[PDB]
JSON list of C-alpha atoms in Angstrom, two decimals:
[
{"chain": "R", "resi": 1, "resn": "UNK", "atom": "CA", "xyz": [109.65, 96.20, 81.91]},
{"chain": "R", "resi": 2, "resn": "UNK", "atom": "CA", "xyz": [109.13, 99.63, 83.25]},
{"chain": "R", "resi": 3, "resn": "UNK", "atom": "CA", "xyz": [111.68, 101.13, 85.31]},
{"chain": "R", "resi": 4, "resn": "UNK", "atom": "CA", "xyz": [111.25, 103.29, 88.57]},
{"chain": "R", "resi": 5, "resn": "UNK", "atom": "CA", "xyz": [109.79, 106.70, 88.08]},
{"chain": "R", "resi": 6, "resn": "UNK", "atom": "CA", "xyz": [111.28, 109.73, 89.89]},
{"chain": "R", "resi": 7, "resn": "UNK", "atom": "CA", "xyz": [110.19, 110.45, 93.15]},
{"chain": "R", "resi": 8, "resn": "UNK", "atom": "CA", "xyz": [107.71, 113.21, 93.87]},
{"chain": "R", "resi": 9, "resn": "UNK", "atom": "CA", "xyz": [105.56, 114.29, 96.98]},
{"chain": "R", "resi": 10, "resn": "UNK", "atom": "CA", "xyz": [101.79, 113.15, 97.66]},
{"chain": "R", "resi": 11, "resn": "UNK", "atom": "CA", "xyz": [99.44, 115.97, 97.42]},
{"chain": "R", "resi": 12, "resn": "UNK", "atom": "CA", "xyz": [95.80, 116.53, 98.16]},
{"chain": "R", "resi": 13, "resn": "UNK", "atom": "CA", "xyz": [94.99, 116.37, 94.27]},
{"chain": "R", "resi": 14, "resn": "UNK", "atom": "CA", "xyz": [97.40, 113.48, 93.45]},
{"chain": "R", "resi": 15, "resn": "UNK", "atom": "CA", "xyz": [95.55, 111.57, 96.36]},
{"chain": "R", "resi": 16, "resn": "UNK", "atom": "CA", "xyz": [92.07, 112.56, 94.77]},
{"chain": "R", "resi": 17, "resn": "UNK", "atom": "CA", "xyz": [93.19, 111.34, 91.15]},
{"chain": "R", "resi": 18, "resn": "UNK", "atom": "CA", "xyz": [94.61, 108.06, 92.31]},
{"chain": "R", "resi": 19, "resn": "UNK", "atom": "CA", "xyz": [91.33, 107.62, 94.20]},
{"chain": "R", "resi": 20, "resn": "UNK", "atom": "CA", "xyz": [89.21, 108.23, 91.11]},
{"chain": "R", "resi": 21, "resn": "UNK", "atom": "CA", "xyz": [91.53, 106.32, 89.00]},
{"chain": "R", "resi": 22, "resn": "UNK", "atom": "CA", "xyz": [91.06, 103.27, 91.23]},
{"chain": "R", "resi": 23, "resn": "UNK", "atom": "CA", "xyz": [87.35, 103.66, 91.41]},
{"chain": "R", "resi": 24, "resn": "UNK", "atom": "CA", "xyz": [87.17, 103.64, 87.37]},
{"chain": "R", "resi": 25, "resn": "UNK", "atom": "CA", "xyz": [89.34, 100.76, 87.00]},
{"chain": "R", "resi": 26, "resn": "UNK", "atom": "CA", "xyz": [87.76, 98.52, 89.42]},
{"chain": "R", "resi": 27, "resn": "UNK", "atom": "CA", "xyz": [89.42, 96.20, 91.63]},
{"chain": "R", "resi": 28, "resn": "UNK", "atom": "CA", "xyz": [89.71, 97.84, 95.02]},
{"chain": "R", "resi": 29, "resn": "UNK", "atom": "CA", "xyz": [86.18, 98.38, 95.64]},
{"chain": "R", "resi": 30, "resn": "UNK", "atom": "CA", "xyz": [84.78, 95.49, 97.73]},
{"chain": "R", "resi": 31, "resn": "UNK", "atom": "CA", "xyz": [87.99, 93.45, 98.05]},
{"chain": "R", "resi": 32, "resn": "UNK", "atom": "CA", "xyz": [89.02, 92.04, 101.25]},
{"chain": "R", "resi": 33, "resn": "UNK", "atom": "CA", "xyz": [91.93, 93.92, 103.11]},
{"chain": "R", "resi": 34, "resn": "UNK", "atom": "CA", "xyz": [95.29, 92.32, 104.01]},
{"chain": "R", "resi": 35, "resn": "UNK", "atom": "CA", "xyz": [98.82, 93.51, 104.68]},
{"chain": "R", "resi": 36, "resn": "UNK", "atom": "CA", "xyz": [100.19, 91.64, 101.64]},
{"chain": "R", "resi": 37, "resn": "UNK", "atom": "CA", "xyz": [97.58, 93.30, 99.08]},
{"chain": "R", "resi": 38, "resn": "UNK", "atom": "CA", "xyz": [98.13, 96.94, 100.78]},
{"chain": "R", "resi": 39, "resn": "UNK", "atom": "CA", "xyz": [102.08, 96.39, 99.95]},
{"chain": "R", "resi": 40, "resn": "UNK", "atom": "CA", "xyz": [101.06, 95.34, 96.54]},
{"chain": "R", "resi": 41, "resn": "UNK", "atom": "CA", "xyz": [99.28, 98.77, 95.82]},
{"chain": "R", "resi": 42, "resn": "UNK", "atom": "CA", "xyz": [101.59, 100.72, 97.72]},
{"chain": "R", "resi": 43, "resn": "UNK", "atom": "CA", "xyz": [104.49, 99.64, 96.03]},
{"chain": "R", "resi": 44, "resn": "UNK", "atom": "CA", "xyz": [102.52, 99.74, 92.52]},
{"chain": "R", "resi": 45, "resn": "UNK", "atom": "CA", "xyz": [102.05, 103.45, 92.88]},
{"chain": "R", "resi": 46, "resn": "UNK", "atom": "CA", "xyz": [105.59, 104.22, 94.27]},
{"chain": "R", "resi": 47, "resn": "UNK", "atom": "CA", "xyz": [107.14, 102.19, 91.25]},
{"chain": "R", "resi": 48, "resn": "UNK", "atom": "CA", "xyz": [104.71, 103.50, 88.59]},
{"chain": "R", "resi": 49, "resn": "UNK", "atom": "CA", "xyz": [104.10, 107.05, 89.89]},
{"chain": "R", "resi": 50, "resn": "UNK", "atom": "CA", "xyz": [107.03, 107.49, 92.27]},
{"chain": "R", "resi": 51, "resn": "UNK", "atom": "CA", "xyz": [104.99, 108.46, 95.48]},
{"chain": "R", "resi": 52, "resn": "UNK", "atom": "CA", "xyz": [106.58, 106.62, 98.45]},
{"chain": "R", "resi": 53, "resn": "UNK", "atom": "CA", "xyz": [104.38, 104.36, 100.46]},
{"chain": "R", "resi": 54, "resn": "UNK", "atom": "CA", "xyz": [103.62, 106.96, 103.51]},
{"chain": "R", "resi": 55, "resn": "UNK", "atom": "CA", "xyz": [100.30, 108.30, 102.49]},
{"chain": "R", "resi": 56, "resn": "UNK", "atom": "CA", "xyz": [98.07, 105.03, 102.67]},
{"chain": "R", "resi": 57, "resn": "UNK", "atom": "CA", "xyz": [97.56, 104.85, 106.54]},
{"chain": "R", "resi": 58, "resn": "UNK", "atom": "CA", "xyz": [93.98, 104.73, 108.25]},
{"chain": "R", "resi": 59, "resn": "UNK", "atom": "CA", "xyz": [93.04, 105.81, 111.61]},
{"chain": "R", "resi": 60, "resn": "UNK", "atom": "CA", "xyz": [93.37, 102.60, 114.23]},
{"chain": "R", "resi": 61, "resn": "UNK", "atom": "CA", "xyz": [90.54, 100.41, 114.82]},
{"chain": "R", "resi": 62, "resn": "UNK", "atom": "CA", "xyz": [88.26, 99.36, 116.25]},
{"chain": "R", "resi": 63, "resn": "UNK", "atom": "CA", "xyz": [85.00, 100.15, 113.75]},
{"chain": "R", "resi": 64, "resn": "UNK", "atom": "CA", "xyz": [85.60, 102.24, 110.26]},
{"chain": "R", "resi": 65, "resn": "UNK", "atom": "CA", "xyz": [89.17, 102.93, 109.37]},
{"chain": "R", "resi": 66, "resn": "UNK", "atom": "CA", "xyz": [89.35, 106.40, 108.02]},
{"chain": "R", "resi": 67, "resn": "UNK", "atom": "CA", "xyz": [92.57, 107.65, 105.63]},
{"chain": "R", "resi": 68, "resn": "UNK", "atom": "CA", "xyz": [95.13, 109.72, 107.40]},
{"chain": "R", "resi": 69, "resn": "UNK", "atom": "CA", "xyz": [95.92, 111.30, 104.07]},
{"chain": "R", "resi": 70, "resn": "UNK", "atom": "CA", "xyz": [93.34, 113.98, 103.20]},
{"chain": "R", "resi": 71, "resn": "UNK", "atom": "CA", "xyz": [92.32, 113.21, 99.51]},
{"chain": "R", "resi": 72, "resn": "UNK", "atom": "CA", "xyz": [92.88, 109.55, 99.79]},
{"chain": "R", "resi": 73, "resn": "UNK", "atom": "CA", "xyz": [88.98, 108.44, 99.30]},
{"chain": "R", "resi": 74, "resn": "UNK", "atom": "CA", "xyz": [89.00, 104.92, 100.25]},
{"chain": "R", "resi": 75, "resn": "UNK", "atom": "CA", "xyz": [87.88, 103.56, 103.80]},
{"chain": "R", "resi": 76, "resn": "UNK", "atom": "CA", "xyz": [88.01, 100.18, 105.67]},
{"chain": "R", "resi": 77, "resn": "UNK", "atom": "CA", "xyz": [84.68, 99.06, 106.53]},
{"chain": "R", "resi": 78, "resn": "UNK", "atom": "CA", "xyz": [84.48, 95.77, 108.82]},
{"chain": "R", "resi": 79, "resn": "UNK", "atom": "CA", "xyz": [81.87, 93.11, 107.73]},
{"chain": "R", "resi": 80, "resn": "UNK", "atom": "CA", "xyz": [80.18, 90.56, 109.64]},
{"chain": "R", "resi": 81, "resn": "UNK", "atom": "CA", "xyz": [90.86, 90.75, 114.65]},
{"chain": "R", "resi": 82, "resn": "UNK", "atom": "CA", "xyz": [88.32, 92.13, 112.29]},
{"chain": "R", "resi": 83, "resn": "UNK", "atom": "CA", "xyz": [87.79, 91.59, 108.60]},
{"chain": "R", "resi": 84, "resn": "UNK", "atom": "CA", "xyz": [87.79, 94.79, 106.33]},
{"chain": "R", "resi": 85, "resn": "UNK", "atom": "CA", "xyz": [86.63, 95.71, 102.82]},
{"chain": "R", "resi": 86, "resn": "UNK", "atom": "CA", "xyz": [87.87, 98.67, 100.93]},
{"chain": "R", "resi": 87, "resn": "UNK", "atom": "CA", "xyz": [84.99, 101.18, 100.28]},
{"chain": "R", "resi": 88, "resn": "UNK", "atom": "CA", "xyz": [84.94, 104.26, 98.36]},
{"chain": "R", "resi": 89, "resn": "UNK", "atom": "CA", "xyz": [83.36, 107.35, 99.77]},
{"chain": "R", "resi": 90, "resn": "UNK", "atom": "CA", "xyz": [83.16, 110.57, 97.78]},
{"chain": "R", "resi": 91, "resn": "UNK", "atom": "CA", "xyz": [82.19, 112.60, 100.97]},
{"chain": "R", "resi": 92, "resn": "UNK", "atom": "CA", "xyz": [85.72, 111.96, 101.95]},
{"chain": "R", "resi": 93, "resn": "UNK", "atom": "CA", "xyz": [87.01, 114.39, 99.34]},
{"chain": "R", "resi": 94, "resn": "UNK", "atom": "CA", "xyz": [85.49, 117.12, 101.31]},
{"chain": "R", "resi": 95, "resn": "UNK", "atom": "CA", "xyz": [85.22, 115.91, 104.98]},
{"chain": "R", "resi": 96, "resn": "UNK", "atom": "CA", "xyz": [88.65, 115.13, 106.36]},
{"chain": "R", "resi": 97, "resn": "UNK", "atom": "CA", "xyz": [87.09, 112.58, 108.70]},
{"chain": "R", "resi": 98, "resn": "UNK", "atom": "CA", "xyz": [90.17, 111.60, 110.46]},
{"chain": "R", "resi": 99, "resn": "UNK", "atom": "CA", "xyz": [90.92, 115.07, 111.60]},
{"chain": "R", "resi": 100, "resn": "UNK", "atom": "CA", "xyz": [87.44, 115.30, 112.77]},
{"chain": "R", "resi": 101, "resn": "UNK", "atom": "CA", "xyz": [87.79, 112.37, 115.08]},
{"chain": "R", "resi": 102, "resn": "UNK", "atom": "CA", "xyz": [91.66, 112.28, 116.08]},
{"chain": "R", "resi": 103, "resn": "UNK", "atom": "CA", "xyz": [92.44, 116.28, 115.96]},
{"chain": "R", "resi": 104, "resn": "UNK", "atom": "CA", "xyz": [95.57, 115.44, 118.00]},
{"chain": "R", "resi": 105, "resn": "UNK", "atom": "CA", "xyz": [97.11, 114.00, 114.94]},
{"chain": "R", "resi": 106, "resn": "UNK", "atom": "CA", "xyz": [96.84, 117.37, 112.98]},
{"chain": "R", "resi": 107, "resn": "UNK", "atom": "CA", "xyz": [96.76, 120.18, 115.78]},
{"chain": "R", "resi": 108, "resn": "UNK", "atom": "CA", "xyz": [100.76, 120.68, 115.42]},
{"chain": "A", "resi": 1, "resn": "UNK", "atom": "CA", "xyz": [114.32, 122.17, 69.58]},
{"chain": "A", "resi": 2, "resn": "UNK", "atom": "CA", "xyz": [114.21, 119.38, 72.48]},
{"chain": "A", "resi": 3, "resn": "UNK", "atom": "CA", "xyz": [112.73, 116.22, 70.73]},
{"chain": "A", "resi": 4, "resn": "UNK", "atom": "CA", "xyz": [112.80, 113.02, 72.84]},
{"chain": "A", "resi": 5, "resn": "UNK", "atom": "CA", "xyz": [111.74, 109.42, 72.05]},
{"chain": "A", "resi": 6, "resn": "UNK", "atom": "CA", "xyz": [109.80, 107.30, 74.65]},
{"chain": "A", "resi": 7, "resn": "UNK", "atom": "CA", "xyz": [111.93, 104.12, 75.85]},
{"chain": "A", "resi": 8, "resn": "UNK", "atom": "CA", "xyz": [108.84, 102.62, 77.66]},
{"chain": "A", "resi": 9, "resn": "UNK", "atom": "CA", "xyz": [105.34, 102.75, 78.10]},
{"chain": "A", "resi": 10, "resn": "UNK", "atom": "CA", "xyz": [103.84, 105.03, 80.57]},
{"chain": "A", "resi": 11, "resn": "UNK", "atom": "CA", "xyz": [100.33, 105.45, 81.67]},
{"chain": "A", "resi": 12, "resn": "UNK", "atom": "CA", "xyz": [99.30, 108.53, 83.48]},
{"chain": "A", "resi": 13, "resn": "UNK", "atom": "CA", "xyz": [97.17, 108.39, 86.78]},
{"chain": "A", "resi": 14, "resn": "UNK", "atom": "CA", "xyz": [97.68, 112.01, 87.94]},
{"chain": "A", "resi": 15, "resn": "UNK", "atom": "CA", "xyz": [95.55, 114.33, 85.52]},
{"chain": "A", "resi": 16, "resn": "UNK", "atom": "CA", "xyz": [98.38, 116.74, 84.81]},
{"chain": "A", "resi": 17, "resn": "UNK", "atom": "CA", "xyz": [100.50, 113.92, 83.42]},
{"chain": "A", "resi": 18, "resn": "UNK", "atom": "CA", "xyz": [101.18, 112.51, 79.66]},
{"chain": "A", "resi": 19, "resn": "UNK", "atom": "CA", "xyz": [100.88, 109.00, 78.78]},
{"chain": "A", "resi": 20, "resn": "UNK", "atom": "CA", "xyz": [102.53, 107.49, 75.97]},
{"chain": "A", "resi": 21, "resn": "UNK", "atom": "CA", "xyz": [103.88, 104.17, 74.26]},
{"chain": "A", "resi": 22, "resn": "UNK", "atom": "CA", "xyz": [107.49, 102.74, 73.50]},
{"chain": "A", "resi": 23, "resn": "UNK", "atom": "CA", "xyz": [108.83, 104.80, 70.33]},
{"chain": "A", "resi": 24, "resn": "UNK", "atom": "CA", "xyz": [106.44, 107.94, 70.90]},
{"chain": "A", "resi": 25, "resn": "UNK", "atom": "CA", "xyz": [108.13, 111.26, 70.10]},
{"chain": "A", "resi": 26, "resn": "UNK", "atom": "CA", "xyz": [107.69, 114.42, 72.18]},
{"chain": "A", "resi": 27, "resn": "UNK", "atom": "CA", "xyz": [108.95, 117.99, 72.37]},
{"chain": "A", "resi": 28, "resn": "UNK", "atom": "CA", "xyz": [110.06, 118.84, 76.15]},
{"chain": "A", "resi": 29, "resn": "UNK", "atom": "CA", "xyz": [108.54, 122.23, 77.09]},
{"chain": "A", "resi": 30, "resn": "UNK", "atom": "CA", "xyz": [109.59, 122.44, 80.73]},
{"chain": "A", "resi": 31, "resn": "UNK", "atom": "CA", "xyz": [112.47, 120.71, 82.67]},
{"chain": "A", "resi": 32, "resn": "UNK", "atom": "CA", "xyz": [112.32, 121.96, 86.25]},
{"chain": "A", "resi": 33, "resn": "UNK", "atom": "CA", "xyz": [112.66, 118.81, 88.17]},
{"chain": "A", "resi": 34, "resn": "UNK", "atom": "CA", "xyz": [112.70, 115.11, 87.34]},
{"chain": "A", "resi": 35, "resn": "UNK", "atom": "CA", "xyz": [109.63, 115.40, 85.79]},
{"chain": "A", "resi": 36, "resn": "UNK", "atom": "CA", "xyz": [109.43, 117.13, 82.73]},
{"chain": "A", "resi": 37, "resn": "UNK", "atom": "CA", "xyz": [106.36, 118.85, 80.98]},
{"chain": "A", "resi": 38, "resn": "UNK", "atom": "CA", "xyz": [106.28, 117.60, 77.46]},
{"chain": "A", "resi": 39, "resn": "UNK", "atom": "CA", "xyz": [103.89, 117.61, 74.22]},
{"chain": "A", "resi": 40, "resn": "UNK", "atom": "CA", "xyz": [103.26, 114.59, 72.17]},
{"chain": "A", "resi": 41, "resn": "UNK", "atom": "CA", "xyz": [103.82, 115.03, 68.28]},
{"chain": "A", "resi": 42, "resn": "UNK", "atom": "CA", "xyz": [100.97, 112.95, 67.45]},
{"chain": "A", "resi": 43, "resn": "UNK", "atom": "CA", "xyz": [98.26, 113.88, 69.56]},
{"chain": "A", "resi": 44, "resn": "UNK", "atom": "CA", "xyz": [99.44, 117.21, 70.77]},
{"chain": "A", "resi": 45, "resn": "UNK", "atom": "CA", "xyz": [98.36, 116.33, 74.14]},
{"chain": "A", "resi": 46, "resn": "UNK", "atom": "CA", "xyz": [100.57, 118.15, 77.15]},
{"chain": "A", "resi": 47, "resn": "UNK", "atom": "CA", "xyz": [101.39, 116.86, 80.23]},
{"chain": "A", "resi": 48, "resn": "UNK", "atom": "CA", "xyz": [104.63, 115.96, 82.85]},
{"chain": "A", "resi": 49, "resn": "UNK", "atom": "CA", "xyz": [106.39, 112.77, 82.07]},
{"chain": "A", "resi": 50, "resn": "UNK", "atom": "CA", "xyz": [109.26, 110.77, 83.81]},
{"chain": "A", "resi": 51, "resn": "UNK", "atom": "CA", "xyz": [112.25, 112.18, 82.66]},
{"chain": "A", "resi": 52, "resn": "UNK", "atom": "CA", "xyz": [114.00, 108.54, 82.67]},
{"chain": "A", "resi": 53, "resn": "UNK", "atom": "CA", "xyz": [111.41, 107.14, 80.13]},
{"chain": "A", "resi": 54, "resn": "UNK", "atom": "CA", "xyz": [112.76, 108.92, 77.57]},
{"chain": "A", "resi": 55, "resn": "UNK", "atom": "CA", "xyz": [115.95, 109.83, 75.33]},
{"chain": "A", "resi": 56, "resn": "UNK", "atom": "CA", "xyz": [117.87, 112.44, 73.25]}
]
């Protein structure tokens, strides 16, 4: 029904607002992660809001995967080849956790 | 002076965007880029809108 909206860059503020909207709407929190579900979400954001799927990557495992794009406030947490669930963390709004653990990704 | 009509439903996620429904009339305030700042004639809410979702 809706066509493709014009493209725009991702920002810290836009990542915050998309994070908050997903927490308010429901659906992402507690959901088991899968590549197929990650594609459905990324492509939805892209068709509805025009952000290319280049901002929804996390730190490589093991353990908790932290978002690479500062402003994205969901993290992937293992539960007991892992099994991960989406979890909102408000600390992520103010602590760039990936840059704290992998400075090399952001030094240049 | 620049009145546009909505062709599709749009739900805004980003806080500085303007939601609307099929048929809503809006005044365009700014046209810098492909996302235009517009104002609703019904609610007088203001925000950016996907320029290809609207006509005239």
